């Protein structure tokens, strides 16, 4: 059975107006801004941006890759696909 989400989990993250996007649950660094209650820090591969999202918008990567892991025109997406597949736990600072 599933556990709750935890830092390092790989997902497709969905925001309004964007296709399901390769992403990870981030850690919060000591001294860094924490997300709101009930939200996780989501690092989106390719664009390297963070947003705060709840589980409803988070699709586990293994299960979802066959549907969502196809090239997309949007900026950063295809770079994103390479990252999540090839070095999803790397520092992208
Ligand atoms: C799916 S995306 O384009 O990487 N996206 C992440 C950050 C958000 O605020 C909007 C842009």
From Swiss-Prot:
Residues 7-64 form the PWWP domain. It comes from the Eukaryota. Widely expressed. High expression is found in heart, skeletal muscle, ovary and testis. Overexpression is frequently observed in hepatocellular carcinoma samples. It is found in: Nucleus; Cytoplasm. Acts as an epigenetic regulator of myogenesis in cooperation with DPF3a (isoform 2 of DPF3/BAF45C). Associates with the BAF complex via its interaction with DPF3a and HDGFL2-DPF3a activate myogenic genes by increasing chromatin accessibility through recruitment of SMARCA4/BRG1/BAF190A (ATPase subunit of the BAF complex) to myogenic gene promoters. Promotes the repair of DNA double-strand breaks (DSBs) through the homologous recombination pathway by facilitating the recruitment of the DNA endonuclease RBBP8 to the DSBs. Belongs to the HDGF family. Interacts with HDGF. Interacts with trimethylated 'Lys-36' of histone H3 (H3K36me3). Interacts with trimethylated 'Lys-79' of histone H3 (H3K79me3), but has higher affinity for H3K36me3. Interacts with IWS1. Interacts with H2AX, POGZ, RBBP8 and CBX1. Interacts with histones H3K9me3, H3K27me3 and H3K36me2. Interacts with DPF3a (isoform 2 of DPF3/BAF45C). Interacts with SMARCA4/BRG1/BAF190A, SMARCC1/BAF155 and SMARCD1/BAF60A in a DPF3a-dependent manner. This is Hepatoma-derived growth factor-related protein 2. It comes from Homo sapiens. The gene is HDGFL2. The chain holds residues 1 to 93 of 671 of the full protein.
């Amino acid at each position: 059975m599933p556990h709750a989400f935890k830092p390092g989990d790989l997902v497709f993250a969905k925001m309004k107006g964007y296709p399901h996007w390769p992403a990870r649950i981030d850690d919060i660094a000591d001294g860094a801004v924490k997300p709101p209650p009930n939200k996780y820090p989501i690092f989106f591969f390719g664009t390297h941006e963070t947003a705060f999202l709840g589980p409803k918008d988070l699709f586990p990567y293994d299960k979802s890759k066959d549907k969502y892991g196809k090239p997309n025109k949007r900026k950063g997406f295809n770079e994103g696909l390479w990252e999540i597949q090839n070095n999803p736990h790397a520092s992208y600072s």
